[PDB]
Amino acid sequence: GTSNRDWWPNQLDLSILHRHSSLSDPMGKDFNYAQAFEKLDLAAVKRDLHALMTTSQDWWPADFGHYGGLFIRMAWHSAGTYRTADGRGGAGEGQQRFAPLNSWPANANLDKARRLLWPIKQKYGRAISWADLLILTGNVALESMGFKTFGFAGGRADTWEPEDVYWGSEKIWLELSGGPNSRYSGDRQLENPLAAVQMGLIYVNPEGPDGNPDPVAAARDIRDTFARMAMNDEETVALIAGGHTFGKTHGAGPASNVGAEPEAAGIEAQGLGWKSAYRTGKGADAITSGLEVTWTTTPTQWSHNFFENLFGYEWELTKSPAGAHQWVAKGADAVIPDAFDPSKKHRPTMLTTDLSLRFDPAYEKISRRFHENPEQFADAFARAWFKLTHRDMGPRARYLGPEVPAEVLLWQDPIPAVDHPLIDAADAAELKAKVLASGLTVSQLVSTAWAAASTFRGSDKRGGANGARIRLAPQKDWEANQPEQLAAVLETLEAIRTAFNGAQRGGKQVSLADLIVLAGCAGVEQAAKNAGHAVTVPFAPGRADASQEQTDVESMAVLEPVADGFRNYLKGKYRVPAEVLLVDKAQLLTLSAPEMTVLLGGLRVLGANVGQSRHGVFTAREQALTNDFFVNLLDMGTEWKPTAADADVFEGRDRATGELKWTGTRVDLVFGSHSQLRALAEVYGSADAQEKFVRDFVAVWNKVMNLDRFDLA
Amino acid sequence: GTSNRDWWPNQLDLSILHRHSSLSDPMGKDFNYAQAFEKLDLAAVKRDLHALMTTSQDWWPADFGHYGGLFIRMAWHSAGTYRTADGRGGAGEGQQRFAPLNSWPANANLDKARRLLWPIKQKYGRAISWADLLILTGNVALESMGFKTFGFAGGRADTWEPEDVYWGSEKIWLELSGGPNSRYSGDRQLENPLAAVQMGLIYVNPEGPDGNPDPVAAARDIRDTFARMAMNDEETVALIAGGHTFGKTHGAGPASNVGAEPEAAGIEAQGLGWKSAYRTGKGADAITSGLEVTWTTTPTQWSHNFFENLFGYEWELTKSPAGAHQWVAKGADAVIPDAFDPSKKHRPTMLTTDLSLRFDPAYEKISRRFHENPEQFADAFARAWFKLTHRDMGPRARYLGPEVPAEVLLWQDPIPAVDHPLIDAADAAELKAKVLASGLTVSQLVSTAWAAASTFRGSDKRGGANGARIRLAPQKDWEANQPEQLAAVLETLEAIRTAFNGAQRGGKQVSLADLIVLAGCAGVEQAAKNAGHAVTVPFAPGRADASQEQTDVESMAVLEPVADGFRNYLKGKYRVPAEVLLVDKAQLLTLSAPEMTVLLGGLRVLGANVGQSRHGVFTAREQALTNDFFVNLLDMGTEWKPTAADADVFEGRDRATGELKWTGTRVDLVFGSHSQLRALAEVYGSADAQEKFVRDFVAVWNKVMNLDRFDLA
Numbered sequence A, B: 001g002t003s004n005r006d007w008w009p010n011q012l013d014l015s016i017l018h019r020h021s022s023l024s025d026p027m028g029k030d031f032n033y034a035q036a037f038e039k040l041d042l043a044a045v046k047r048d049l050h051a052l053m054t055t056s057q058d059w060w061p062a063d064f065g066h067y068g069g070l071f072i073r074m075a076w077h078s079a080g081t082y083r084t085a086d087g088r089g090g091a092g093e094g095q096q097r098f099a100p101l102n103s104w105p106a107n108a109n110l111d112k113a114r115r116l117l118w119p120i121k122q123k124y125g126r127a128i129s130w131a132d133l134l135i136l137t138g139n140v141a142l143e144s145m146g147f148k149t150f151g152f153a154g155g156r157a158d159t160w161e162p163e164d165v166y167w168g169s170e171k172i173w174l175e176l177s178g179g180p181n182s183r184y185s186g187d188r189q190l191e192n193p194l195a196a197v198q199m200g201l202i203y204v205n206p207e208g209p210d211g212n213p214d215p216v217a218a219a220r221d222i223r224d225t226f227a228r229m230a231m232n233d234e235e236t237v238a239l240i241a242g243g244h245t246f247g248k249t250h251g252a253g254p255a256s257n258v259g260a261e262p263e264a265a266g267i268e269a270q271g272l273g274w275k276s277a278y279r280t281g282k283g284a285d286a287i288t289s290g291l292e293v294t295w296t297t298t299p300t301q302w303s304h305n306f307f308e309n310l311f312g313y314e315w316e317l318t319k320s321p322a323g324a325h326q327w328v329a330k331g332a333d334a335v336i337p338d339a340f341d342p343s344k345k346h347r348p349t350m351l352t353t354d355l356s357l358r359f360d361p362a363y364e365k366i367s368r369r370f371h372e373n374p375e376q377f378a379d380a381f382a383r384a385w386f387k388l389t390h391r392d393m394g395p396r397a398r399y400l401g402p403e404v405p406a407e408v409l410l411w412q413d414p415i416p417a418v419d420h421p422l423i424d425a426a427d428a429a430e431l432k433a434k435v436l437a438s439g440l441t442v443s444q445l446v447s448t449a450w451a452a453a454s455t456f457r458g459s460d461k462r463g464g465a466n467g468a469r470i471r472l473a474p475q476k477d478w479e480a481n482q483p484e485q486l487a488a489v490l491e492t493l494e495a496i497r498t499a500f501n502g503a504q505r506g507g508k509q510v511s512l513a514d515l516i517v518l519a520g521c522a523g524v525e526q527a528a529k530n531a532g533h534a535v536t537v538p539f540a541p542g543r544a545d546a547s548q549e550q551t552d553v554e555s556m557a558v559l560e561p562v563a564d565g566f567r568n569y570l571k572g573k574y575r576v577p578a579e580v581l582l583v584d585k586a587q588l589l590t591l592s593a594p595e596m597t598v599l600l601g602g603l604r605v606l607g608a609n610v611g612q613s614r615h616g617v618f619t620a621r622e623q624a625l626t627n628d629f630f631v632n633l634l635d636m637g638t639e640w641k642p643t644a645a646d647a648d649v650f651e652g653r654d655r656a657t658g659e660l661k662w663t664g665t666r667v668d669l670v671f672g673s674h675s676q677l678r679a680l681a682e683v684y685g686s687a688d689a690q691e692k693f694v695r696d697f698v699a700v701w702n703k704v705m706n707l708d709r710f711d712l713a
Ligand code: HEM
Pocket: A063, A068, A069, A070, A071, A072, A073, A076, A203, A204, A205, A206, A222, A239, A240, A242, A243, A244, A246, A247, A248, A249, A250, A251, A287, A288, A289, A290, A291, A353
């Protein structure tokens, strides 16, 4: 069947905004996963998972009699798709169970691991999500094998369809770099927002870069990709050596024995894939990656034997039975147990990427410290495993259950507890009138609140106005935030706050985070009044102010908005057209196409553009909240043409006289071009729509102001 | 960006069930278009439209000073995508304004037409849909030019994204037959459900079949495609000759001067396309189809000149200025006016497809009668135009406004008005107890009600249980309906009804349509009781019984369910896999994927399969409403393989013993294979889900029973 994507492969795709509707969700619209989870008997779940670890099923027999290694790799892969650049990927939505992740080559035979867990999922039903179960299972594995975890939080609600994520442009699984859709350019520079070296891998190629078995060069790829997953050198060494303390790889025969991935298999495979014609197809004959390595002498128990081996032997390049490059210990005795035959033993083996931990000079120092002090190793691995598996969960307010750790970690962008009474509606009214009396304009108040709140991204639930981090490094100096204007606004609001707080009793006070948002609300109310409309913008207090010491400046860098179509901003010239970047930002904000449209049209006429650009400001009453953007955009009396200076800027001229009326960007004009967006613009540009436009704008403004407010969930 | 449809281009696409969510719709979920329309001043809209007819805009000047012909073509195209095979296409959702129809080659320059209507649309806002406006505009064009219409109904609610319709598999616009994705096989047999001869055309090629200018051969294509749009020979002649009484074609220069269609044009084109480099690009220089034909001596007035010309001259094959085949009248004077220059006249011209009306022997007889009796032509064209433009609107209950014709037409599948008191809840309880005391089984009650109600399709709103057409020809004889079983059920119900109605006073009675549905509800209640659940199923009375003379047997043929996965039925072996047909049927039923899933799993255990097939009947308590389908389907204790006898039937065997436990079709096993469907099955196969399953099943049952109940809207 030929589709619109086939005929117009470069048109903008809006379906990405319209996923996760109540149509596709089988749970009631009233279902609240947090409340279901809070009544789960988590201890009972963990006992069943503990019993599972050593209950081998004949359709996928457990190596060494223990599924622990399999499940730790399963949880690691669930979390390991995360990219700091956009927050997309991670374990938080249980997306391993859907396309394309369920069928990535690097996920081969994790379909078996998930199926092992069905009986437990079936038993507990809606009170534990797949997403939470995958993580919990990896924790129980580690515990059952003698490793003390740092903690676990529930609260990952299941999703019911695949996410639309850019995983790369290659058309061939595992394609080596330098092809027509190369994710690499220059000196091995990986394109943003990607965090893997090849399409269908998690981080790196276990044989080495593009299959070249050089541990030194492999270390560069490890460092790059792990950094793009928010992990530093210590964390990376802890994780890889920690994971590879357990279990084994599977490469018993040639890879050409392995059939179709789950999404391509026949109907009879019932959602499983990679069916293998090599010998029994499973167990001792398993083929997963094509590598055949077993790292330690006790693969089913926590130990420090990974480093004892890595440092205690010299390593020789060899090939598995499938032909993959891997390494074996020179001169060693057969000390590693076999997974099925207790009368066979093997020499120690390693992957190229394991040897990176010894042959890269910065890794080596950490690996040596962890070898000499395995208690330091254990603690670093526990902390890193917690971070790995929770990095996309969002604020601590979303963490559920009895195993949540009490230690607050810097990477959580923590927000202090509120320890005083909050402002009420009459105080809010009083503050809004003081803000308006100070002389701050609609444009300044709207712009500042939009800057503070619009750092939120629903992908990993980081960012938003809670914390008042806009006043801190590095937000206060971002070019999109207009640092000089911002500093002057913030100083006026801080003086209002100090005067309000100093006049109170009872210990009531207002945070600056709350006041920035409330001042934005006042701005919107005043804009509506300027157009002849009386509205109240809803406001919910309770935000708190974070300190600079509770804010990791480097980790905050990925939230910098380099493209923000809502403020008509583009920090430089990109390969991706600006309208595509708009839709991308809208998806991170959790906005539908109607919400995006109304929000943008309102922000234009309120003066939210960076630098006070007149691009898209299609009104003669700036700072009044009207539907003028839409009415003027859609006026066929105006003709539009790209400028000589810039193909990305357009002049709108009177068709009859040639007089210049307006200028706009691709982000402004896409609303009069794209057939679905123009149909939305028409609704808000109609003669009956001014009241609807105001009401819808206020509702979307309030939604953005509240995006991080999980303390009110 | 590589997507899941790139990697797995044959996987089933569920997004078609999850279109038209409240996420993409800008109107509130409380918006009710019928109520808005009811307040429209329709008379005022018609005055504005009359004014527009001769208000020429310089960017697309009106031929002859009058846009009437352009608008008639616009409305005809809006309606003309309709296919009786699936009811998809038609004017009823205003889809001409979205991709791909906004950019079909046959819709060239109708983007100009729609843009001329923007000021009117803007003025009246939500109180007139685009969908209604396009048709109303065609009506007003006809009236402005002297032709009295049969009437008009409002009520086509706008839609807000493109529909997912199969328009064909060709990858080239207008591709000629016999390519790699040919829509034709055998002796020029057009594949179902298509109703056009080439990708991007409405019905046929105006130059003749595959561009060969043979009017007799063209007539065969006209007849076949018009029949696939629900039109007979008389209606077809009346429509083509009536349309081509007005206006002209556009082919002033070579087609290579015409640029990108709207979905491919640059953003500065603001939603318009086909910009032409030929002279001024417009008006006298316009290029639309490439043909250059003006049919009558008065193109802006209703006349009898079409047939006078067709019969009064002999025709010679010639070429337009763009190179297209067309016909000119031999020996004629220059009697046809020019559209822009009062000192130019032209000879009569015709399309190949106009000459079909004279040289096909069956059309010739009609054309002659219309020539000799122009009042019969007029009346035929008025009735046909009404039909063309309302064929997809559904029951008369959905027709709004003051110009609805009072005459009831056969093609509307009319249902008599109810003129007596309806049954109340006490009566309903009494009838259900009688049905249950008669000996009818769960399986019979469920199957008969399902058969009655599941003929509905939302694409054109035909079908459903209202009218009790299941008792009439041809529904009573469909193999999917099990004619012998059905006849025995219906005779028992008719005896129940006759005894109930004979005992009443005050004129109360129950229709057979209502009793079929009510008996189906009793069967569901009984099934729930069989499983230990106390469930009352909602029922709404008010259906009426249509007669045989109100039921066109030929028009009913397209509702015959040749694939109904809900009853595990397939009438023959088709090239489209059966799970694709299941999703297609779900879409016509208006079901989401969770609704499809719950409905199918329950029907399987209630005994709704055709012929009492055991395929997918994964329970040992048939006729009890349980979630057994899901629990057994997902049991990993069973392994599945296609049978040797048949690749489309599967055997499920105990993994450990090899013993056969179940059989299933592709439709059954898809629920355990497709990763999204299996995630839904898991929710209903969980240990906490038995009550959920029963309740969701009842809700979806009721939804299907009420699909055609526009009398209660
Ligand atoms: C440079 C990063 C990494 C590379 C290239 C990598 C590579 C692989 C490969 C190729 C396999 C074999 C798959 C198979 O044949 O069954 C595997 C197994 C495994 N990996 Fe990793 N790994 C990495 C990091 C991690 C991390 C961070 C963890 C967890 C903390 C992890 C835990 C495991 C475990 C437990 C297994 C054994 C699975 C089993 O017993 O079935 N790995 N690794």
